[model samples]
Target: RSETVLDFMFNLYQQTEEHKFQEQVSKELIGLIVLTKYNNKTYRVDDIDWDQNPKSTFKKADGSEVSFLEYYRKQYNQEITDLKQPVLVSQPKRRRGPGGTLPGPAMLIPELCYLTGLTD
Candidate 1:
């Protein structure tokens, strides 16, 4: 297989593993993105947020919180009667704040920078 194909398969396996890990730890995470059969609607698991913060998932008139995963599932279900297969998409949300799981130096550098008097 070409390097591109091998890379894809390797990444796919990793993403599947990550999704399973997310399922175990019920944090708001979109593990993957996929399409359904009906309307061919697209969905992403990490898109779901049970807390449904307006800042994250956008505003809603009902104000009732629903996970982005749930909403996407519903939309996809409506469009496609069933999903043919899953698609690899999106890495998990890295833990923020101190002792985080973000790669290397960490992403929430604003706090770290502030603490170090590096704020500009």
Candidate 2:
């Protein structure tokens, strides 16, 4: 139904009305600074978990496992799309040493991170 790569490359699919933030993991977002919409903090993409998604499970304060999709949907009333999309792993470097501030890295939802520059 198409040409040898010409049609595939030339096709300019229009992004629908639901076009909001980044729904997929991209190289552009990698290594760039991002401000999280959830906790209001900034961090870099230390790594990306391509194997994980919104449907991926995580531990809670109660020591129970819950997927990111259920947590957001139940608590925040958020219906996250692209359930197969990769998750960003943010490892914030501790300004203080010895005491250790939380062992660091937090897995972040790409949709919740905003693309921007570092301020001061």
Candidate 3:
């Protein structure tokens, strides 16, 4: 019943959302980052086998074993929190007059607030 390009785009967007949800579930079951310690060095990757690779197990600061999925989720949550913080942008310098010297920087603006029309 869809005949327009917008319909097709919307369908694609919905499909992408479903795919992303599935990917998130899979990552929760597995992990987004798989870290392993080999030869006294740590290695990170998207996928890894913890059972086969016995030396790749993760440990907490208290010497307790940690799961890769749990660690990835914790790190991911922290990163998202960090990204939600306010951003500061310095204003560009303006010339005092035609061909005159540039003036000092102006006050900063929250980039997200400016983009969302929250700040003037």
Candidate 4:
């Protein structure tokens, strides 16, 4: 288990630019930030698909009612509804990265060096 959550100093896109950088950074460790563009519409991790009517109801194969995105978000994660008309999800804090509760490779560098008897 991670002793502390790892919040990256910089954003994901900037961090992924170089192979050496990505190779050094933990992939499962990520963060999200919400943004707005073009009028007051909000955007986040997933962009809006105009084809998806925000107010429409979804129908199952047998013509049963399936919850729409708005309904689903409202019922489940209420935080999603507090957002702007077009909301975006960002600012993800990873309590643990890819492997649950395990320290990521980057976090083990110092220990690796110590075990290998590498001098400073």
lDDT values for all models: 0.31, 0.53, 0.29, 0.28
Which candidate ranks first by lDDT, i.e. highest? Answer: 2
Off by over 4 Å in 4: 1-48, 69-120
TM-score of each: 0.20, 0.54, 0.18, 0.19
RMSD, each candidate, Å?
15.2, 10.9, 20.5, 16.7
- Candidate 1 Cα outliers beyond 4 Å, as residue runs: 1-29, 47-120
lDDT of 3 by residue, 14-109 (tens): 666756844543343221222121122222122212113212235334466654334445655421121222222232332244454254321111
lDDT of 1 by residue, 69-117 (tens): 4554576532211122222222245445455534332111010111111
Top-down lDDT ranking: 2, 1, 3, 4
Candidate 4 per-residue lDDT over residues 56-102, each given as its tens digit = 44443446544444444554552222212222223223344455523
For candidate 4, the lDDT comes to 0.28
Whole-model lDDT for model 3 versus the true structure?
A: 0.29
Q: Model 1, residue 106: what's the lDDT?
A: 12
Which ten-residue region of model 3 has the weakest summed lDDT? 111-120
Worst 10 residues of 1 by lDDT: 106-115
The reply for model 2, stretches above 4 Å from the true place, is: 1-30, 61-63, 92-104
